[PDB]
Design a protein around this ligand. Structure first.
Ligand SMILES: Cc1cc2nc3c(=O)[nH]c(=O)nc-3n(C[C@H](O)[C@H](O)[C@H](O)COP(=O)(O)O)c2cc1C
Ligand SMILES: Cc1cc2nc3c(=O)[nH]c(=O)nc-3n(C[C@H](O)[C@H](O)[C@H](O)COP(=O)(O)O)c2cc1C
Lengths: 307, 307
């Protein structure tokens, strides 16, 4: 019968839940256009700092059989660039736009948010604030960051979270997030931090920054991502959860949604395949839903069965 | 090509670096005997509490294409049983023995160590104290725990660590462990905590306890294990590191050792294959060493090349 990947949230309509992960194929004008032109339901711009940033020395990304490792070091074109893309260039007629922000201090985030507010009101761009020790592993730094943005930014927004690995941490993070009604979505997860890939043939690490230590993505991270999606799905019932981590197929995405995901972001798989991946993912997810006789995402979002 | 997998540490000689991971295939008398009869260089008994524990309701372990998920809940025969095995049954002639301890409180570890001391002294059993919201993720508690144990246990021991994901955490944990000369080895890592596996066919989780959340092992964890091994190798130059996580082949073990491992523990792969796996692994590591023109482990232990 009839089937739909449509999602409705944050006062927008999305043709499907798929979008890129912040930082993957969303740095340059061409990349942003290409994401807008793709079959994805949305897109998010590369996490930005106030000024242009070169990022870390190369090699700083390596694809792997089971995913990827990277230490990009936030290379990006600067806030003015992404702001201008949001203000003047993005076709909102095609799909909604998220802007990812990753200031190097609280003060940097405060300053960009003050400027973002106008473009968010007028054009409807949606902030994804990157919190992902790094800010979200320090609950005090995390509270302080959110308080500061909330104070100065007169709009809803969402937060991109590093993975946690303990229920006490799920509770502590959710408790903080729930004190901020402007945080209306939570993106789980960023990379699994600081893995170390060694190439047995060269007896060496495979990226240059940080003695070879870098964030893991891809097949490595799927169960951690599902854990985090579901953990915050349960503990933040007043908020949406966006999934990110280990999506290569419609079936993978199906798992994200079962766990509680509203949108589903694609990192490593998109890096390897390019924006055409979104045509395949939509098809595949529709195929999974057809075989299981689901017609909408609402039917099974967050309905994973426990034993 | 005269090669040796010999390891020498804590006044002991080990034929090869391989042993079981604590908790895999060593809960019962039969299992400990089979581990002693196997080709492994050593073995460690199931993490013990003061009294026997039934553990969590089943299913509580699931093997996966990329590894395993479990929430066993420390099922074990109790401290008296493993103490008795160490004191009266274990053939130290065949290989050295480690005893893993996991009291649920500092007081419980203290009282077990008081009684373990005499057996360590007399028979040579070596303690691996399991610090893996839980205690390893709380740095003040960790110091307190090690102070308490160090006060009553006049022998070298090692600690079993959960993975960390941030350089600031590597630094903080290492600084504590470096306060304690009795901590002569560090085992990296326990499982990646609280993953969530969801079976797309059944639309459900795969283990019963804790709504399907459980510790991940196997291929999922290898780069995290290598990071922690190398992280602690670097920051604790006075100690040895035992690797644990994602070892299926002699090549995996080669990577553990390059990262800095002295002993190499085998969990998931051993659960799936049984103790004969140790003949395969010794054979495969020698093959990898012959191809790379190494004769001994310390020729390349810790010698991973950075860029
Ligand atoms: C090359 C690269 C660049 C990334 N850049 C960012 C970023 O700028 N901001 C961010 O929040 N996450 C960033 N990430 C993390 C991804 O957004 C995503 O959280 C992670 O890769 C998990 O998704 P995957 O398993 O689909 O790769 C990056 C990941 C990669 C591989
Ligand atoms: C069924 C099972 C039981 C375990 N029991 C223990 C335990 O009692 N004590 C402990 O420190 N670690 C325990 N672990 C964790 C392993 O020691 C090891 O740290 C982890 O499985 C990663 O190694 P692997 O990737 O080789 O599985 C257990 C793991 C599994 C799968």
């Amino acid at each position: 019968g009839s089937m739909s990947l449509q999602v409705n949230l944050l006062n927008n309509t999305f043709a499907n839940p798929f979008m890129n992960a912040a930082g993957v194929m969303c740095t340059t004008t061409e990349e942003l256009v290409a994401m807008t032109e793709s079959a994805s339901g949305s897109l998010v711009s590369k996490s930005c700092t106030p000024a242009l940033r070169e990022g870390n020395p190369t090699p700083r990304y390596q694809a792997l059989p089971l995913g990827s490792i990277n230490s990009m070091g936030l290379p990006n074109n600067g806030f003015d660039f992404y702001l201008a893309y949001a203000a003047e260039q993005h076709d909102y007629g095609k799909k909604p736009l998220f802007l990812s922000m990753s200031g190097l201090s609280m003060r940097e985030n405060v300053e960009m948010c003050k400027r973002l507010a106008a473009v968010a009101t007028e054009k409807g761009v949606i902030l994804e604030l990157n919190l992902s020790p790094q800010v979200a592993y320090d609950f005090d730094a995390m509270r302080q960051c959110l308080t500061a943005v909330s104070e100065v930014y007169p709009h809803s927004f969402g937060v991109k979270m590093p993975p946690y690995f303990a229920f006490a941490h799920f509770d502590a993070a959710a408790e903080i997030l729930n004190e901020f009604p402007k945080v209306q979505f939570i993106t789980c997860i960023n990379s699994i931090g600081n893995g170390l890939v060694i190439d047995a043939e060269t007896e060496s690490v495979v990226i240059k920054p940080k003695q070879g230590f870098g964030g893991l993505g891809g097949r490595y991270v799927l169960p951690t991502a599902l854990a985090n999606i579901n953990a915050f799905y349960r503990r933040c019932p007043g908020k949406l959860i966006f999934g990110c981590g280990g999506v290569y197929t419609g079936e993978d995405a199906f798992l994200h949604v079962l766990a509680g995901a509203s949108m589903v972001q694609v990192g490593t798989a998109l890096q390897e395949e390019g924006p055409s991946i979104f045509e395949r993912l939509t098809s595949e997810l529709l195929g999974v839903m057809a075989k299981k006789r689901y017609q909408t995402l609402d039917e099974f979002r967050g309905k994973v069965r426990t034993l």
